[PDB]
Amino acid sequence: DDFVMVPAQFPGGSMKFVYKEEHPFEKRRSEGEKIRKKYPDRVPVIVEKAPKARIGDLDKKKYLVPSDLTVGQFYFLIRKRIHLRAEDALFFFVNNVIPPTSATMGQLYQEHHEEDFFLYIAYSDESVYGL
């Protein structure tokens, strides 16, 4: 009867990550399934610098994040890990879009997790992914 109202702001596609190139899909997927069962109130997240970003790199890519943590809290966390200056910008991208700062990480996971059961976030100094 009714139409599915496809959102005007629908995401882009998945993004390339060095992490996905360096860890075979079936190994990631098996790990993701297991970590979701072990910590069901947390979400597994891979965080990587976007292509062409001019910003410090993380020493750790893998984060197990409480599902109620907001995207804003996760920005605050990442800023501190790379000692961003007060005047430095930080943008996240999931499936090519900037996620809402007020979303929870659990909400982002539900909408954007990939087939390996991970959520992938790219970060940048720029507001356009890959620029």
UniProtKB/Swiss-Prot annotation:
Cellular location(s): Cytoplasmic vesicle, Autophagosome membrane; Endomembrane system; Cytoplasm, Cytoskeleton; Golgi apparatus membrane
Recorded coiled-coil stretches: none
Gene3D superfamilies: Phosphatidylinositol 3-kinase Catalytic Subunit, Chain A, domain 1 (3.10.20.90)
Lipid-attached positions, Phosphatidylserine amidated glycine: 130
Annotated InterPro entries: Atg8-like, Ubiquitin-like_domsf
Primary localization class, coarse: membrane
Quaternary assembly: Interacts with GPHN and NSF. Interacts with ATG7, ATG13. Interacts with ATG3. Interacts with alpha- and beta-tubulin. Interacts with GABRG2. Interacts with RB1CC1. Interacts with ULK1. Interacts with CALR. Interacts with DDX47. Interacts with TP53INP1 and TP53INP2. Interacts with TBC1D5 and TBC1D25. Directly interacts with SQSTM1. Interacts with MAPK15. Interacts with TECPR2. Interacts with PCM1. Interacts with TRIM5 and TRIM21. Interacts with MEFV. Interacts with KIF21B. Interacts with WDFY3; this interaction is required for WDFY3 recruitment to MAP1LC3B-positive p62/SQSTM1 bodies.
Function comment: Ubiquitin-like modifier that plays a role in intracellular transport of GABA(A) receptors and its interaction with the cytoskeleton. Involved in autophagy: while LC3s are involved in elongation of the phagophore membrane, the GABARAP/GATE-16 subfamily is essential for a later stage in autophagosome maturation. Through its interaction with the reticulophagy receptor TEX264, participates in the remodeling of subdomains of the endoplasmic reticulum into autophagosomes upon nutrient stress, which then fuse with lysosomes for endoplasmic reticulum turnover.
Record-given protein name: Gamma-aminobutyric acid receptor-associated protein
Species of provenance: Homo sapiens (Human)
Gene name, Swiss-Prot/TrEMBL: GABARAP
